[PDB]
Amino acid sequence: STITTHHLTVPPGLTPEEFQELSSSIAEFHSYRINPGQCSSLLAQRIHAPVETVWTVVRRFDKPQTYKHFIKSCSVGEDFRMTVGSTRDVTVISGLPAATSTERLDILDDDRHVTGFSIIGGEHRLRNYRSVTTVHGFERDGEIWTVVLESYVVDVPEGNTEEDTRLFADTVVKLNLQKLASVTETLAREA
């Protein structure tokens, strides 16, 4: 059992100067105690849009399809409210027969721009998956931009190397963060 070290390495796609401004947030929100058989990763994405524009999309637990790829549909309860412990049923585009991943909302902090979720049923390739996404505003000489950080911890299935699990989860997260950027930059450029 160890503690992750995401707060001591510059995540790809981030400047060292950006990283050093984010160190405390990475320690607070993007650290995990990991056991053997588990792996963890931290991904970053710079977005040329204001923080609240990005957050408004990131915080919509009931509409992951807005920025995530491979979502066929997302269903929530009839009296769903955006509250910790609530769940969503996501239908992922797998090439396999129709199914659903049940996901639990773990964190929602509208003041600090933190959210996170856990996969609690369905996707057997990501058993014990848990992620946290945070949104951060930057300013330099009157210019503003945003950085989104997303980390996860996950169990490595029996009969898989860590390096294959990480490579799948990283690719999904990185692609989703790219879509988040395009979606919110379009919104920023247009609105």
Added chain:
Amino acid sequence: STITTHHLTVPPGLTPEEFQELSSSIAEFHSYRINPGQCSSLLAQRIHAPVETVWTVVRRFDKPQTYKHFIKSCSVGEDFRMTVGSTRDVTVISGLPAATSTERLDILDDDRHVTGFSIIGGEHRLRNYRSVTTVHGFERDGEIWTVVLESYVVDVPEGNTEEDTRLFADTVVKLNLQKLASVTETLAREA
């Protein structure tokens, strides 16, 4: 048994005027006779780069990782030459235990900018997968751009709707074409 009708519908992300310039090419290269239990799709991507810049990337059968997502590695023979009937072994990022998809190069026409491949082993979700990619130059008042068209035909696995198979294959193709655009536009803007 029917003939696909990709040449009579405007593919998403294409203007009707672009489509009507491409009708003959869609009929020649992006038509398939499909049997029940099979589905087919045509995808388009506009790229702001010259045709040969895009083609140089599209034609590299031995380096699909340059524009495709989820590729861990690609291996070809020791005396591999870029010739029809040649194969490549691609390791796809599945979240599942390491494996390989064997893919056959079906077409290569450097004069008409046509290529295509078939999956001939591995990916059981895409049995009988076959695609064709063509690259087309456009000009308007001295401005030039490119359009890439990619179609496939594939068997729908037992225990799957067509709509789930198509949605997976379409998402993969569309995402790959997006990467192709970014890769080649970067190359065009920079070089």
